[PDB]
Each structure stands twice: as structure tokens, then as C-alpha cells.
Amino acid sequence: PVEEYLVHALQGSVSSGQAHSLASLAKTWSDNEGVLLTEKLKPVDYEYREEVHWMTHQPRVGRGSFGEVHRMKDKQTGFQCAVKKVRLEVFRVEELVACAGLSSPRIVPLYGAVREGPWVNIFMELLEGGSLGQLIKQMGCLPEDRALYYLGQALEGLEYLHTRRILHGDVKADNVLLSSDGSRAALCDFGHALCLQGKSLLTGDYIPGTETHMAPEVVMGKPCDAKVDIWSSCCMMLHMLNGCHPWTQYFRGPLCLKIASEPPPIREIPPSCAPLTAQAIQEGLRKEPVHRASAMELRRKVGKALQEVGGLKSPWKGEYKEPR
Ligand SMILES: CC(C)(O)C#Cc1ccc2c(c1)-c1nc(C(N)=O)cn1CCO2
Numbered sequence: 001p002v003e004e005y006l007v008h009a010l011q012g013s014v015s016s017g018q019a020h021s022l023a024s025l026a027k028t029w030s031d032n033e034g035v036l037l038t039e040k041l042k043p044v045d046y047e048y049r050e051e052v053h054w055m056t057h058q059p060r061v062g063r064g065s066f067g068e069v070h071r072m073k074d075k076q077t078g079f080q081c082a083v084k085k086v087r088l089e090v091f092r093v094e095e096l097v098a099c100a101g102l103s104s105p106r107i108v109p110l111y112g113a114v115r116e117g118p119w120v121n122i123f124m125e126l127l128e129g130g131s132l133g134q135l136i137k138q139m140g141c142l143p144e145d146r147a148l149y150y151l152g153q154a155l156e157g158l159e160y161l162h163t164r165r166i167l168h169g170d171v172k173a174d175n176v177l178l179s180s181d182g183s184r185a186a187l188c189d190f191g192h193a194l195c196l197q198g199k200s201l202l203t204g205d206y207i208p209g210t211e212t213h214m215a216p217e218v219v220m221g222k223p224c225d226a227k228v229d230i231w232s233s234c235c236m237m238l239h240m241l242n243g244c245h246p247w248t249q250y251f252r253g254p255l256c257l258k259i260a261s262e263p264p265p266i267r268e269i270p271p272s273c274a275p276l277t278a279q280a281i282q283e284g285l286r287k288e289p290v291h292r293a294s295a296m297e298l299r300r301k302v303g304k305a306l307q308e309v310g311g312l313k314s315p316w317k318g319e320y321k322e323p324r
Pocket of ligand 1: 063064065069082084095101108120124125126127128131174177188189190193
């Protein structure tokens, strides 16, 4: 009966501990209590409380889709990190399971999680390059070598998650974080993650991902599996190359109905892209998932595509390129 007793020992306290203890505790969330995974963040007398033990950086800047991610500092240690707020009432444990104990360089490092009142505060390493989405806004669009470089890295993270039977569920540039120099990319924002065998995504309370990157099986209410992440990642590739999401420049009225009815958006592949770049995007945008490339398959092909155009040579932030 021991799992029960391990969980009760964690409840009512913030402790220094390991990812597996955190995941056990967070399942009861899905008053001050949590597990912190690094000695950079430390509890003080069984507690870790906002504005008492850790402080958000002033003035409060606000990042993420809901401005729910902030820079913060542990008052005792002085170490800085990022914190994501999730409302307790809609917290999904899968978000932690996707990044807890997952020592992979393409997954944002998790430093811990603490429940305080109506919040779940999720602590993680601070990546200073900004998001891939922000990078696209600033540059207009990315050159092909850089676009192949970051898609590869994203697919390395999806390989990792898929091998663990975890599906990201919202793969897009806004959820890829860059290192301070731009050379390392990491998946974040696992709030739509799902633990797998495949079956329909559209049942009960499920909150789905971003409409423009939705795979047709998601939209039609069909059996979904890891392959939905591949579709989205190729929609992300189109976003990088063109500087706008797929589907938006040909349709405006509800985009989910076009994804069901129309052929995939392979016409949005730029003419100037090299053959294998085009080939790879086509293999990730096959409508039926059985015919669509896995993460492993597509990552190998995106790797070769990049080699075929001379490797990564463009600077991280070059000159502006107007979106088509
Ligand atoms: C991993 C988890 C908790 O699911 C998550 C997350 C999550 C969601 C949205 C985000 C970020 C992170 C984010 N993290 C950093 C950073 N670590 O430096 C910077 N941003 C800005 C983009 O908005």
C-alpha cells in the first residue's frame, strides 16, 4: 500500500526532493505544498510562498500566451529562474510528467512546482534567447538553414517524448525556447500534453492546441497518436519560412473546416526551398497519420536537408525578411 503513504508525507509541505516525488504529489492537484528539484530554490520551514521566499522581478514584465510566465528570484539563494502560473482548478499533471525527470537538452529543465492557494507555480530554467515565435516576429521570417536547424532540434525533443508515450499537443514556435546565443532550442508549454498507448482527442474536458497547426485527425474527431505533433511541427516550419501561420493567407472564415476538406498546405512551401526541404515538409503534412512521418524519420530527413544546403551558416539574427 506504500504509494499512498509516500504521497501523504509530501502533502502539506514544500521540500527539496526528486522529480518522481513531485509527479506523485502533483497528481493530487490534477495549502502551501510542493517539491523543489534544485538547491537554487529552497524551502524555509516547510514553506515556499510568493513575495516571501521568492520574488518576481520588478517591473513585472509578463510572457507567454496569457502573460503567465515571469522572471523570479529566490530571496535566500539569489538564483533567478522562470515561473509559470497555472490555475489550480485546471492544472493537468501531464504538464509536469512531460518535463519531470526528463534530462534531455530539447526539453526545458524543470526546477520544481509549488501549490499556493489557487495557483500552481512551476519553476524552470531561464532561457534568455526568447521564444522561436518572438524570433519570427523580429526577423519577419527565417532563412531555410536556420528553419531546418530549429525544426530538427524540435523533432529531437518530440523523439524523446514520443519514446516515453507523451504527446506534446501544441507544437509551435511560441513553445520553443532559444538559448542566449540562438544555438539551442527547447520544447516548453506542455499544458496540452497527453500520455498514450491512439484515440479521439475531442472528448470530455480536453483543451486542444492551436487551430492553424491542428492535424486533420484532430479536427475530424479521429484517432490521434504521436503523429499529430509532426503535422504541427511542419506547420511550424511553414511559419518560420513564410512568416505567417499556414492556412491564414488563403482562408479567414473557420480554419478547422478547411483542414478537414482541403489537401494539406504543401502549396505554401516556398519555390526557393531545396528539394529535400520540400520533400520533408510534404512527409510531415500527409493527412492520414499512418502515411505521415514519425519524429525519428522526419528528424533524420531534416538533418540531411540541412546538410544538402551547406549546413547552418546564417547568423542567428541577420537582416529582416518580408513575410509572403
Ligand atoms: C514547461 C512548462 C511548465 O509546461 C512551461 C512553460 C512555458 C510556457 C510558456 C512560456 C514559457 C514557458 C517560457 N519559459 C521561458 C523560460 N524558461 O525562460 C520563457 N518563456 C516565454 C514563453 O512562454
